[PDB]
Structures are given as structure tokens and as C-alpha cells.
Amino acid sequence: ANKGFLEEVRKGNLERECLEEPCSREEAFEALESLSATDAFWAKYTACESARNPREKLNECLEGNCAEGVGMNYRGNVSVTRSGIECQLWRSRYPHKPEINSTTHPGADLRENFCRNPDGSITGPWCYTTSPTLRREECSVPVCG
Ligand SMILES: [Ca+2]
Ligand SMILES: [Ca+2]
Ligand SMILES: [Ca+2]
Ligand SMILES: [Ca+2]
Ligand SMILES: [Ca+2]
Ligand SMILES: [Ca+2]
Ligand SMILES: [Ca+2]
């Protein structure tokens, strides 16, 4: 958090600096190296802001197996919709040409065809469907708690 007497003369650390105290993106960055793991982190971190405490509650929401809030933290391997319709590869461009994708929203983990919520749609984790008629649709993922 940048709060002592000479903390920044030391090697940045993730537990100390961000998981034990709140942090700036620069502090996380400084403790990660890869900008890529920082994008990944910062994303699953900012989405867990309302689950800081307890910290077992923080470890839950950062793990991504449960949707917390609107499920922007969700990083699970569920890929079928609310209706049962399978999801379109995020990287596929057919049947629907996704406007949301890895270059656009790099912290999210648009892998395979797994439900996500890169955007924080109020209906939660979604994905694009394979049905030509239904572009996107919410998915049923276990809620943090
Ligand atoms: Ca600190
Ligand atoms: Ca610091
Ligand atoms: Ca630091
Ligand atoms: Ca600790
Ligand atoms: Ca501390
Ligand atoms: Ca710096
Ligand atoms: Ca610093």
C-alpha cells in the first residue's frame, strides 16, 4: 500500500502489497513483472474489491470458481448457457462476430468457449452462442458463498 518508511526500496511482493493491503496497479505490476500476469491479476483483483474481507472470502473470489456479484471474477470452465445451448469459441468469428475479445479486454480470460462477463452485464457470466439466432446469453454459475 505504500505506507511505511522506505517500503519502495524493497522488492515488491504480492501477499504483502496487494493481498494483505490494498494496492495500486503499479504496486501489482512491480510485484509481477509480466504485464500479462498484471492484466490477468488486476482484472481478477478489481472484480474482487467487494470481497476483500474476510480474506478466505478474498481467496474465494480470486480463485474464480464462483461468480461474486455479477461474476466478473468468474474464471470457471462452464461453457453452456442458461438455455443449454453450447457457447461459441471466443476466438471463433462464427456464428457471431464477437466485439469483445482478448485485445479489447485482456484481463478477462476468454479461453475456449467458457462463460465469462468481460463487461459486467448485470445478468452475469455469459458467452456467444452457437445458435445462429441467439448471439449472447447468460450462463448458470455457482455464486460466491
Ligand atoms: Ca506496503
Ligand atoms: Ca508498496
Ligand atoms: Ca512495490
Ligand atoms: Ca499473509
Ligand atoms: Ca502490511
Ligand atoms: Ca514503478
Ligand atoms: Ca512503487
From Swiss-Prot:
Superkingdom of source:
Eukaryota
Q: Which residues form the Kringle domain?
A: 66-144
Residues modified by glycosylation = 77, 101
Positions where 4-carboxyglutamate occurs in the chain: 7-8, 15, 17, 20-21, 26-27, 30, 33
Q: Give the transmembrane region(s).
A: none
Cysteines paired by S-S bonds: 18-23, 48-61, 66-144, 87-127, 115-139
Q: Could you tell me which residue ranges the Gla domain spans?
A: 1-47
Residue ranges the record marks as coiled coil? none
| Designated name of the protein | Activation peptide fragment 1
What's the source species for this entry?
Answer: Bos taurus
